RNA sequence: UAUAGGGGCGAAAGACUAAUCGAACCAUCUAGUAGCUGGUUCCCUCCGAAGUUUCCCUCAGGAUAGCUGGCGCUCUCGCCCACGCAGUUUUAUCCGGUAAAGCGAAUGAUUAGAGGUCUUGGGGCCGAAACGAUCUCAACCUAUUCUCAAACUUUAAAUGGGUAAGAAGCCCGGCUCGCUGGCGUGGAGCCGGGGUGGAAUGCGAGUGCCUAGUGGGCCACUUUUGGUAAGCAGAACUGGC
RNA sequence: AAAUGGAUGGCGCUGGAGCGUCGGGCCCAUACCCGGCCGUCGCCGGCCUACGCCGCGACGAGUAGGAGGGCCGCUGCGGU
RNA sequence: CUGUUUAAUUAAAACAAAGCAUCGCGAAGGCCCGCGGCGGGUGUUGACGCGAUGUGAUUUCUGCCCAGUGCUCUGAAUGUCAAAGUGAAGAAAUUCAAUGAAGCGCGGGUAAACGGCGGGAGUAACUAUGACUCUCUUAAGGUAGCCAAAUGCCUCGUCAU
RNA sequence: GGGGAGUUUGACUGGGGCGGUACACCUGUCAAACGGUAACGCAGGUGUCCUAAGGCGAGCUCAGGGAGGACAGAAACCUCCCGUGGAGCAGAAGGGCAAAAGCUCGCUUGAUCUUGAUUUUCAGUACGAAUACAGACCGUGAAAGCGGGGCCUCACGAUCCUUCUGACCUUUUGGGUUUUAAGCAGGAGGUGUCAGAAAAGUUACCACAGGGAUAACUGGCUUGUGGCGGCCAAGCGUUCAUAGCGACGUCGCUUUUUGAUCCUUCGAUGUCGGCUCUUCCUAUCAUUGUGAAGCAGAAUUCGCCAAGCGUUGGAUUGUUC
RNA sequence: GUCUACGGCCAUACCACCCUGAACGCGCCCGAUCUCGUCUGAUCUCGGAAGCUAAGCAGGGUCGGGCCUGGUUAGUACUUGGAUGGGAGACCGCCUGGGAAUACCGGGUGCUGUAGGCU
């Protein structure tokens, strides 16, 4: 198999599975969530983030390493059952390969060598989130170093950021205990429902 | 032995070396395309002018000078 | 090597908008087209029979001719040398009036007016048209209420 | 394909449209003492050999069917040819296809 | 002494045939042809490129167009206003589907949770078995949720493309039509008199003929195709050698 | 970590002759401004070889190639 | 084996050799020369001769295939078939028709003529391999011999010296 | 009838050949929101089919899903409802279409004649295809109207020669008749290398004019491959991550392998290996001085400054190995 | 303030549900002998006028779904031109100009052209 460095930046257009690719090899990663997926949204309450800086491409197989790394650090850090972790990053840009010579000049140096599909890689932009890991109030560190444990694997250059919103949520966490308290955002199961005003008012005769 | 295909490179300096300069509009630009039986229609109305012309025309021109 | 073709490469150019598929409008045919008036050209997906050339989408042109169900254009096409005055015959489907030529009657109309109405009074009207001049000297208010002071927001992620 | 027998067409020495038969155009042998076979003979003749070439790489699978409409009026015996783009197979007269028919094999 | 050149001779190496033999020597056709190398002679002044479109048994070439030069010719300024033109801007005017963005909007991919279960399939329970009843999973539906599309798209930039900014125009009257037709209706053509100051800036324009060279290019900011990449191969605008 | 000895150009430089932010001076291109001279072009001026004699202004590089001038040069012929 | 071979890069395993086979010819012939003649060589020759090929001391062996490509032979029973000749139509040029010499096509023979000589499945009281057997194919499926050879890619095949 | 004589051995091409047709014509992207724009760039196609699958007019609405009805079951047929195109329109795709361009029904060949102009590659040349007209004869509906082929984007062919069709035509040479021949206009017989020659192979016996526009050496640009290192630390190491290794990932150097391109070299740079000989490099095998071990001694393993000094004799192989 | 017949724009005017409709008109509706066509007078055609606004239709309502418009997103993502700007690169900042969209929120939901009948 070729090095990461020969397919790091983005030097092409995305590349697909689609219907006119007709082959390519399977991904590496299989499940993007490790935690307790059947956990409430007032279980955990902060939550971290892996923000890239740099404009690359990373490979499904760094990201399954990576989230192993994770997972096995988190499970002795904080317990099994006791935090949620989630790979954003979804791979779909397939770089080809051209093998060359299946050693002798007897065939072709670069006549046709459009090459076939080699694997899987992920485009990440400046600015997007890689992983996010959402735990206890107190599992804080916890978070911080897995995720600089997660940096060392990841190509590139990526830093850690713990957001304000409440979970994976898009509302702050300031505005999320008084905000569900009185009938404006629904718990359902990992995420939340925002009910608007503009409904019918069977919606709101069913609460209260 | 291969070589350049096609390139457009340094062609719109050899054209506005000469000019693109628009074609040259002049009244009464042509007649050809024009329905044939428009175009015989303006030729019988053409040919047919002067019979009544000459006569009816002297008329209304004499009494506009007249008028003024 | 790239396909030459009659409508090559007009996957959205000949395409109907979104939500107005269907059959044409009747209003477009009922519009009158003389020798002489300023239209423009714009191809229509709905009916395949008189379509012009990809070439000459979105295209303004005088017209020279008119028959039962087109009519015929004079449009200048740039080829790659020169322009050649090239007469088309296209249906009444995918020809428009061009605003253009109406505003400039219009204004033309508004000082042909304006001269003869002024004429009178003696007034030396300024129907000449011009660039927006530089504003004058102006006297801004403050009533009493202090500037607002800007300051730059600290960065945070 | 599949061509009727009978056709009322125009017809170009009364200049009215009038029942033509449709039959097959069988190309007529040349004869001798044409010009042309009369020049090929003089020039192969000799110890030349094949002055003129014979053609090879044949690629076109078929012709162009025309037909030979003749008009049916008396006193008439007006001729002429009409020909159709390509095609391999070629049927002068048959019956009509019809739909919900019988076509069970 | 016999065999003399597409011939002789050859225990066969296509060896020998007067230092030359997979076709001798001598003279002539012959200054044979070459899209292929090399060369091509004095000065000064002025102008001054192309390696690009199309076609060819075309790819080391030629024809055509384009770039260039020469010969002119037809007019215009030079004693409150010009004809005309522009690799440009300004005002009106449409044209488009890229950048970006979206898929809790169409299509195609896509992770996880929550509720409802009409039905389907796999388990456990009451018990002769039973759409008689019950718990759970798969499947379906609903409202959300994470990530993408050069050959997806609701929406949609900048840049950019065409037209117009007058006297070749407008208002008025009258004739012709074999065009059309309720109508002296409509539309074209012609005639007659009256009224130029119509966005800014800059500039003198128009046109005819003949025509050499070129028809291997390369590099750079930016946008991009194949390639891991290349002082690699192939494109768009502009500039340079 | 790479094979002849050797490359911020070298010598060398450490309160700088290094890095970052700058100030006032200074150095020179066939570039710019002023002036002289040569040529081309345009506008011309005069009843002084008119194919000559002047005046003003703006411009001058250049392979392949195209034009004009030569009171540059060699040979022979008709006049002088 | 002796012998010959590329004068001026090869001396040989190459060529030649006796031997072993095959083919044509009884002279108005066989194989060839020749622009020409009933001209010339074999031929001052006659099947123990001449002309044309293959293999290459002696011994023993000379396997199977005529399907294809070549060679050869046969019957105007039999298809194709040129000039010339015959009949008919037409004023004639011309057209049509009947018959049809070799050759081709059909059939037989010939491989010491050129050449070729496959591929699956089940079967031994340790098991496998495999005595033995069924089947497609075309004309027949490598027999007697010999070998990792001057012939074997895998290969510096395996065993013994 | 290669015994002999003449001639040919297509082109593109990351050297040439083999492979393929990017050689003729289309759809989408490449293509950077006008048009145009390349590669042996991607994903696909074409040399046909249709007397209807053309034209007109009328009627109806499709794919799918929901709830029911004797055999009937996932799918037979009937009825109701939802049903904006999720079906179909001959075939590869794009666009387009709902009292429709889709299905059915009834008449029909306008898929027939004729002269021009125009659009598309464009040199604005031709062929092919297509547009709008005009002049006669017809189809269709009552009619407005539509139709001179397929809803649109491809589905095809110069000169010369041959054949056919038409004039109640022209010439057949001193003048008449006839056969024949030539002549005008348009249809066909083909140039798939598709703007169109009639064409097999080898030369290691080779020759000529040239090319570094173009391979086999070296050097040069990158290092995929090869070799040599670093980081993270899941684990091996009886216990114990890092004495010694260290997977899943990831970051670097090298031209001691091969490969990619063809920049210099074609009026020649003598192209394998071995022998002799000099110098240099260090990523150190040993030797000098050292640190760490799962270093009791000895023998070992991992590094540090370190190229001063050595790194042999033979069997078989041309061998590098 | 409204409808009918013919129409322009073609969802501000479509979809689901719930209320109102006086006098004309639209229609529902009653019947196959003639015109006409199917299995069926259901649909299309010549005869209406016994009842009705039940339905279509016209208005109104839904903290309605869609559609248009306006804020927010946001001078943010992008982009014309420039630099001897930064960085090893990937990329980023600055100067001169233009400037997008989804979430989220708020407002609306038919206007008219010709002929005609009513209060
Ligand atoms: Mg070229
Ligand atoms: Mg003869
Ligand atoms: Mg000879
Ligand atoms: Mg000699
Ligand atoms: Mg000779
Ligand atoms: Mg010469
Ligand atoms: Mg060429
Ligand atoms: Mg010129
Ligand atoms: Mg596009
Ligand atoms: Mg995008
Ligand atoms: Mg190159
Ligand atoms: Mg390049
Ligand atoms: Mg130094
Ligand atoms: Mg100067
Ligand atoms: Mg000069
Ligand atoms: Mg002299
Ligand atoms: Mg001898
Ligand atoms: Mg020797
Ligand atoms: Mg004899
Ligand atoms: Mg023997
Ligand atoms: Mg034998
Ligand atoms: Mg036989
Ligand atoms: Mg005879
Ligand atoms: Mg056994
Ligand atoms: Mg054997
Ligand atoms: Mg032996
Ligand atoms: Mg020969
Ligand atoms: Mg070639
Ligand atoms: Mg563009
Ligand atoms: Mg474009
Ligand atoms: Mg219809
Ligand atoms: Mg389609
Ligand atoms: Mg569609
Ligand atoms: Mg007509
Ligand atoms: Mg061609
Ligand atoms: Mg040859
Ligand atoms: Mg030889
Ligand atoms: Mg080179
Ligand atoms: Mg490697
Ligand atoms: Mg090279
Ligand atoms: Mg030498
Ligand atoms: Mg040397
Ligand atoms: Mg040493
Ligand atoms: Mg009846
Ligand atoms: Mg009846
Ligand atoms: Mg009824
Ligand atoms: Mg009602
Ligand atoms: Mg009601
Ligand atoms: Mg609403
Ligand atoms: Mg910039
Ligand atoms: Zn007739």
């Given at each position: 198999r070729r090095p990461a460095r020969c397919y790091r930046?983005?030097?092409?257009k995305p590349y697909p599975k689609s219907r006119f690719c007709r082959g390519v090899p399977d991904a590496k990663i299989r499940i993007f969530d490790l935690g307790r997926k059947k956990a409430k949204v007032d279980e955990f309450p902060l939550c971290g983030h892996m923000v890239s800086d740099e404009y690359e491409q990373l490979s499904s197989e760094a990201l399954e390493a990576a989230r192993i790394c994770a997972n096995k650090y988190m499970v002795k850090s904080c317990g099994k059952d006791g935090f949620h972790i989630r790979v954003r990053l979804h791979p779909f840009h397939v770089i080809r390969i051209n093998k060359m010579l299946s050693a002798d000049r007897l065939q072709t140096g670069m006549r046709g060598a459009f090459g076939k599909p080699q694997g899987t890689v992920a485009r990440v932009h400046i600015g997007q989130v890689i992983m996010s890991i959402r735990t206890k109030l107190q599992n804080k560190e916890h978070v911080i170093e897995a995720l600089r444990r997660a940096k060392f694997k990841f190509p590139g250059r990526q830093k850690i950021h713990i957001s304000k919103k409440w979970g994976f949520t898009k509302f702050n966490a300031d505005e999320f205990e008084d905000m569900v308290a009185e009938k404006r955002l629904i718990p359902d199961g990992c995420g939340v429902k925002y009910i608007p005003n503009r409904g019918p008012l069977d919606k709101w005769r069913a609460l209260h | 032995a291969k070589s350049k295909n096609h390139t457009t490179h340094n062609q719109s300096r050899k054209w506005h070396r000469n000019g693109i300069k628009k074609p040259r509009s002049q009244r009464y630009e042509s007649l050809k395309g024009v329905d044939p039986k428009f175009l015989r229609n303006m030729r019988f109305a053409k040919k047919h002018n002067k019979k009544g012309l000459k006569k009816m025309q002297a008329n209304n021109a004499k009494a506009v000078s007249a008028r003024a | 090597t790239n396909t030459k073709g009659k409508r090559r490469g007009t996957r959205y150019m000949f395409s109907r908008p979104?939500?107005?598929?269907?059959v044409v409008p009747l209003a477009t045919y009922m519009r009158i087209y003389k020798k002489g008036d300023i239209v423009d050209i714009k191809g229509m997906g709905?009916?395949?029979?008189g379509m012009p050339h990809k070439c000459y989408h979105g295209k303004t042109g005088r017209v020279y001719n008119v028959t039962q169900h087109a009519v015929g254009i004079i449009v200048n096409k740039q080829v790659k040398g020169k322009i050649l005055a090239k007469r088309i015959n296209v249906r009444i489907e995918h020809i428009k009036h061009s605003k253009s030529r109406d505003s400039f009657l219009k204004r033309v109309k508004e000082n042909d007016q304006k001269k003869k109405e002024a004429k009178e009074k003696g007034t030396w009207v300024q129907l000449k048209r011009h660039a927006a001049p530089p504003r004058e000297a102006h006297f801004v208010r403050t009533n009493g209420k202090e500037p607002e002071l800007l300051e730059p927001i600290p960065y945070e992620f | 394909v599949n061509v009727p027998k009978t056709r009322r067409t125009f017809c170009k020495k009364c200049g009215k449209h009038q029942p033509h038969k449709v039959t097959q155009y069988k190309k007529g042998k040349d004869s001798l003492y044409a010009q042309g076979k009369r020049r090929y003979d003089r020039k192969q003749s000799g110890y030349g050999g094949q002055t003129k070439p014979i053609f090879r790489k044949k690629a076109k699978t078929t012709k162009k069917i025309v037909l030979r409409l003749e008009c049916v009026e008396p006193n008439c015996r007006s001729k002429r040819m009409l020909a159709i783009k390509r095609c391999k197979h070629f049927e002068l007269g048959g019956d009509k296809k019809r739909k919900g028919q019988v076509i069970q094999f």
């Open positions: 930046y983005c030097k092409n | - | 979104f939500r107005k598929h269907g709905t009916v395949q029979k | -």
